[PDB]
Scaffold this active site. Structure first.
Site: not given
Ligand SMILES: O=P(O)(O)O[C@H]1[C@H](O)[C@@H](OP(=O)(O)O)[C@H](OP(=O)(O)O)[C@@H](OP(=O)(O)O)[C@H]1O
Length: 343
Positions: A107-109, A112
């Site tokens: 979920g963490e930018a 990703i």
């Protein structure tokens, strides 16, 4: 008469295998350590990568969590993990289908970004000359992901045509355009089959990657001279642009939203009003530029930008969109940055 084998008991080994998997699914670092200590896994990044790539009885969300980590070891595992994927002679959608089967995006930018950078680098090595840079590949990968969301998530009302998808990607290839038929092929593939996501819960990034940019006609109040003008607004990359006509490339004005806030306001004459203002510097003129009738570009003269919407619903929508723009989204911003280095 015939002799028979001595068959070894497999009870304890199967139990350790099962134990290792159970542990991994609760805590990937601890499961991997258990397997190594129990001589069921070798300790190199390449060996751990093969274990995760096979992923037998492994939770694919947990695999993504582990691969995204900033640790030196995890970074090495990630590179070896992407190297076990063969992307040669596949187009970008086909390569993404393959990659996205192997794990679920965290979920963490920042996580990703690390994973998609690793993917884009691998894709470009496997398919040289297709894209002029890793950045191009990375950005197009997210254009494909956003397309998947737009086409397949019922919450997105306006479904892009092939031609919209083609034109949306103008300039992406380090300033130039990718082949029309390549973009069309990617579009058609996604339109025909959404990304198949393993263990899909219906809330995957690939299904919920929305476009927050907005456009529409609104009525705006002037600066020194208090006249109301109908203008075409576009919100993108934390800036509010406004135009005389929808077809103009040159805006009438540009309002950077950094350091601003928005509030609903009563106006004596106009309904459904909101105002941009600087919350930290009360009464200060807002940094903006606009054009004069003579064609000069000059600084704006606004302490506030008061804007009237045609309905209470549209006022609410614009306020929500502008607030969201101001609060920012780390990953939207990271994509914005790559797009700037492309151009
Ligand atoms: O058209 P008239 O009645 O002459 O009045 C103009 C418009 O309201 C302008 O809006 P637009 O630029 O959308 O045409 C506005 O510029 P802003 O865009 O800065 O609001 C001017 O503000 P001042 O230049 O501050 O007077 C104002 O003098």
């Amino acid at each position: 008469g015939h002799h028979h084998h001595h068959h070894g008991s497999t009870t304890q080994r199967n139990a350790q295998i099962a134990m290792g998997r159970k542990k991994f699914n609760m805590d990937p670092k601890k499961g991997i350590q258990f397997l190594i200590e129990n001589d069921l896994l070798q300790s190199s990044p390449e060996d751990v990568a093969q274990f995760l790539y096979k992923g037998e009885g492994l939770n694919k969300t947990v695999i993504g969590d582990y691969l995204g980590e900033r640790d030196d070891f995890n970074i090495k595992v990630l590179q070896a993990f992407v190297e076990l994927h063969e992307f040669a002679d596949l187009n970008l959608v086909q390569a993404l289908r393959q990659f996205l089967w192997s794990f679920r995006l965290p979920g963490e930018a920042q996580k990703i970004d690390r994973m998609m950078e690793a993917f884009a680098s691998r894709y470009c090595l496997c398919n040289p000359g297709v894209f002029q840079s890793t950045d191009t590949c990375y950005v197009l990968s997210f254009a494909i992901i956003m397309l998947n969301t737009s086409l397949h998530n019922h919450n997105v009302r306006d479904k892009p045509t092939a031609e919209r998808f083609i034109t949306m990607n103008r300039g992406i290839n380090e300033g130039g355009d990718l082949p029309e038929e390549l973009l069309r092929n990617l579009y058609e593939s996604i339109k025909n089959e959404p990304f198949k996501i393993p263990e899909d819960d219906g809330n995957d990034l690939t299904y919920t990657f929305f476009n927050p940019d907005r456009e529409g006609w609104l009525l705006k109040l002037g600066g020194r001279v208090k006249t109301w003008k109908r203008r075409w607004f576009i919100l993108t990359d934390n800036c509010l642009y406004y135009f005389e006509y929808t077809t103009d490339k040159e805006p009438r004005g540009i309002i950077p939203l950094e350091n601003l806030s928005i509030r609903e306001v009563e106006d004596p004459r106009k309904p459904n009003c909101f105002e941009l203002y600087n919350p930290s510097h009360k009464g200060q003129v807002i940094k903006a530029c606009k054009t004069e009738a003579d064609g000069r570009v000059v600084e704006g003269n606004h302490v506030v930008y008061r804007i009237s919407a045609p309905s209470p619903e549209e006022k609410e929508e614009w306020m929500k969109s502008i607030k969201a723009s101001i609060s920012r989204d780390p990953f939207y911003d990271m994509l914005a940055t790559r797009k700037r280095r492309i151009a």
